[PDB]
């Protein structure tokens, strides 16, 4: 309880609106309300790859900030699952990332633990 400290540092996203209206900072838990048949999913791994941890503009550098992209799906369909292979795998964008992802096909039990991993 005595570890945590109230925010103080932005992080850019590669998206505009989601930095302007609502502005990304480190240690921020930002829920992203999705709905049903939507390409939420896309805009995830999409803006994923765009991302680059940044606070240059504040007066700091960016050399000593390792960027850890940790990616976790669940319930993935044939289709979707390849979009994954498409982004990371696009170039080496796994150059800073790991996948983890329990299909629907996969047991729902193992599912549960899935996050707890990358967490």
């Amino acid at each position: 309880p005595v570890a945590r400290r109230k925010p103080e540092q932005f992080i850019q996203t590669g998206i505009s609106t989601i930095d302007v209206m609502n502005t990304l900072v480190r240690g921020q838990k930002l829920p992203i309300f999705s709905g049903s048949g939507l390409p939420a999913n896309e805009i995830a791994a999409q803006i994923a790859r765009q991302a680059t941890v940044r606070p240059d503009l504040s007066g700091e550098g960016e050399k000593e900030e390792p960027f850890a992209v940790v990616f976790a799906a669940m319930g993935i369909t044939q289709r979707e699952l390849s979009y994954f292979i498409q982004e990371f795998e696009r170039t080496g964008a796994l150059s800073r990332s790991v996948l983890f992802l329990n299909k629907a096909d996969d047991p729902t039990i193992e599912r549960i633990l899935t996050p707890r991993m990358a967490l």
């Binding site: 696009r90 170039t91 080496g92 964008a93 150059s95």
Partner: protein, 62 residues
């Protein structure tokens, strides 16, 4: 006669004013273009290089 001479005297300087206005109207058309053509093409040079290098970079990341 001299009467109609004044009518003459009126017209000749006007002929020249049509021309002066005109001269400026060709030149400006010319100059509107000069900056505009130059200024887009710069941007399209710019844009094409970046849209290249960042790919090759991302390729380097592979």
């Amino acid at each position: 006669s001299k009467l109609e001479a004044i009518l003459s005297q009126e017209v000749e300087a006007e002929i020249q004013a049509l021309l002066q206005e005109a001269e400026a109207k060709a030149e400006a058309v010319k100059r509107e273009a000069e900056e505009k053509a130059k200024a887009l093409l710069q941007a399209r040079e710019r844009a094409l290089e970046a849209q290249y290098r960042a790919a090759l970079r991302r390729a380097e990341s592979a």
